[PDB]
């Protein structure tokens, strides 16, 4: 702020000031909320909670069975060398 | 074709359950909020963004 004498910025908005309206009064709010509406336990979604496989692993049962059989053919016999 | 060839779309998870089965032109209707027009004939939006 600048006061510049002798034209002196007035000391105050005075007193011939024009009062407009009484209306002030913000009216104080009474009130009573509800939010009762029967409340069913569940709700439906495609999934929720399931962590799903990106691969999974190859996975197997086993089984075997069988006999001890067998066909043979032998070496013929050599004479032996040394010993 | 202008949707007349279309009963309707739909984002569907494994359920069955669809989050946004909806006729031609509400589908569009939904894409005219993100580009403020109509892609071509036959060419249809979904942003998941």
Redesign the interface.
């Known amino acids: 702020a600048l006061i510049n004498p002798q034209f002196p910025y007035a000391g105050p908005v005075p007193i011939p000031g024009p009062a407009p309206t009484e209306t002030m009064p913000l009216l104080n709010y009474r009130v009573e909320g509800r939010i009762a509406g029967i409340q069913q336990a569940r709700q439906?979604?495609?999934?929720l909670q399931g962590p799903h496989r990106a691969v999974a692993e190859q996975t197997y049962h086993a089984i075997g069975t069988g006999i001890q059989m067998g066909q043979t053919f032998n070496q013929p016999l050599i004479n032996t060398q040394e010993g | 074709n202008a949707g007349t060839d279309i009963n309707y779309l739909s984002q569907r998870t494994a359920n069955f359950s669809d989050t946004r089965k909806l006729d031609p032109k509400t589908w569009a209707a939904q894409t005219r909020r993100r580009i403020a027009t109509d892609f071509p004939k036959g060419v249809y939006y979904c942003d998941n963004r």
């Open positions: 439906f979604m495609p999934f």
